[PDB]
Design an enzyme around this catalytic site. Sequence first.
Site, PDB file in Angstrom:
ATOM      1  N   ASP A 246       0.799  -1.223   0.000  1.00 58.46           N
ATOM      2  CA  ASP A 246       0.000   0.000   0.000  1.00 58.46           C
ATOM      3  C   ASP A 246       0.836   1.281   0.000  1.00 58.46           C
ATOM      4  O   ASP A 246       0.455   2.275   0.618  1.00 58.46           O
ATOM      5  CB  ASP A 246      -0.946   0.000   1.207  1.00 58.46           C
ATOM      6  CG  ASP A 246      -2.176   0.866   0.994  1.00 58.46           C
ATOM      7  OD1 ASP A 246      -2.404   1.330  -0.144  1.00 58.46           O
ATOM      8  OD2 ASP A 246      -2.922   1.075   1.974  1.00 58.46           O
TER       9      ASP A 246
ATOM     10  N   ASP B  40       1.916   4.127   7.401  1.00 59.29           N
ATOM     11  CA  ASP B  40       0.712   3.319   7.568  1.00 59.29           C
ATOM     12  C   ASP B  40       0.969   1.879   7.146  1.00 59.29           C
ATOM     13  O   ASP B  40       1.486   1.635   6.061  1.00 59.29           O
ATOM     14  CB  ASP B  40      -0.454   3.917   6.778  1.00 59.29           C
ATOM     15  CG  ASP B  40      -1.776   3.235   7.084  1.00 59.29           C
ATOM     16  OD1 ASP B  40      -2.545   3.773   7.909  1.00 59.29           O
ATOM     17  OD2 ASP B  40      -2.044   2.160   6.507  1.00 59.29           O
TER      18      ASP B  40
ATOM     19  N   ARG C 224      -0.218   9.282   0.372  1.00 65.25           N
ATOM     20  CA  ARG C 224      -1.153   9.423   1.482  1.00 65.25           C
ATOM     21  C   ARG C 224      -0.776   8.530   2.659  1.00 65.25           C
ATOM     22  O   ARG C 224      -1.253   8.735   3.772  1.00 65.25           O
ATOM     23  CB  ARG C 224      -2.563   9.062   1.030  1.00 65.25           C
ATOM     24  CG  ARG C 224      -2.742   7.573   0.883  1.00 65.25           C
ATOM     25  CD  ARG C 224      -4.155   7.196   0.519  1.00 65.25           C
ATOM     26  NE  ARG C 224      -4.338   5.752   0.616  1.00 65.25           N
ATOM     27  CZ  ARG C 224      -4.155   4.905  -0.392  1.00 65.25           C
ATOM     28  NH1 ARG C 224      -3.797   5.356  -1.589  1.00 65.25           N
ATOM     29  NH2 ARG C 224      -4.340   3.604  -0.203  1.00 65.25           N
ATOM     30  N   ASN C 225       0.069   7.535   2.407  1.00 63.54           N
ATOM     31  CA  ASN C 225       0.494   6.605   3.452  1.00 63.54           C
ATOM     32  C   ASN C 225       1.901   6.882   3.957  1.00 63.54           C
ATOM     33  O   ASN C 225       2.460   6.098   4.722  1.00 63.54           O
ATOM     34  CB  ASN C 225       0.377   5.156   2.983  1.00 63.54           C
ATOM     35  CG  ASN C 225      -1.046   4.642   3.038  1.00 63.54           C
ATOM     36  OD1 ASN C 225      -1.892   5.202   3.737  1.00 63.54           O
ATOM     37  ND2 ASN C 225      -1.320   3.573   2.302  1.00 63.54           N
TER      38      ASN C 225
END
Length: 303
Positions: free
Chosen positions: A153, A171, A157-158
Amino acid sequence: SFSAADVYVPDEWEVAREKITMSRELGQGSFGMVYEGVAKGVVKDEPETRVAIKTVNEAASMRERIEFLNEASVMKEFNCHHVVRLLGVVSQGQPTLVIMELMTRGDLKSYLRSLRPENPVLAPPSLSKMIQMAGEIADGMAYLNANKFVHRDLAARNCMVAEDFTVKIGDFGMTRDIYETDYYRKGGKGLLPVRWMSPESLKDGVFTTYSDVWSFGVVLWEIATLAEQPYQGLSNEQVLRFVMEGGLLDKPDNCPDMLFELMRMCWQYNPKMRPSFLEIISSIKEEMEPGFREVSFYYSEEN
Ligand SMILES: O=C1NC(=O)c2ccc(Br)cc2/C1=C/Nc1ccc(CN2CCCC2)cc1
């Protein structure tokens, strides 16, 4: 009283509730609201530390609380300068708290967008700044893959941005342990966004360090676009066909030639023709700023 937090997290990760003070909302996490706070006595040699506080309420299903705690157990292990650190847990009370490292500038995606000309301290990054972000992200990924984990992932955004602008992987909800096998095959329904997935992941739900490298290519693109949506103009379903059949993102306007060439190596159709994160860092190491050698996984004994 007695709950999941008493059982699923070791008591030696515990930190006293009265050593924690909450200050304001930072944003919605995957299990509850995240807050900013100060922790008195949780970091080495530091009397106080600014922290991020993740919560799970008394009024949350036992199932999600168990998931919350398990997700914390995985992060426990990760100790790398380019991975957001878990500092402890407040299990003996309610709400259950997981104390994280504070990243004052938030998630990389919305940070990049804030740099767009549409704050005297926020300007589009030079090629040099972009290389720094790249090596730092790649370092943290080298670290994961080395401990035999696949992120699954990777995306802007992570990742999160620190006060001094250091970027870190932030994350880990989707990480899988790949010791022994070196891949993870998704059985059923998955929730990873299509626009960041490798061709082979899209086709067979196979995940490796190579498919992590594919995603890295996509976050380079995000950095060069100050976080535009990849494959704009296509719907999610059209991205699936486009990328599975060998289509690629176009070089962003004004994008440094070097950065795009790096994306191209990451977006090889044959996963085995991609670079490893170690090879990526190696190719830009002399362009990293001095402090990299004292903090990275790259120049550690682990490596
Ligand atoms: O610092 C942080 N560390 C974490 O581990 C974490 C985990 C899950 C979630 Br959701 C959030 C965090 C977290 C967030 N930091 C964080 C810091 C500042 C802000 C607000 N500012 C507005 C414009 C500039 C930034 C938002 C999030």
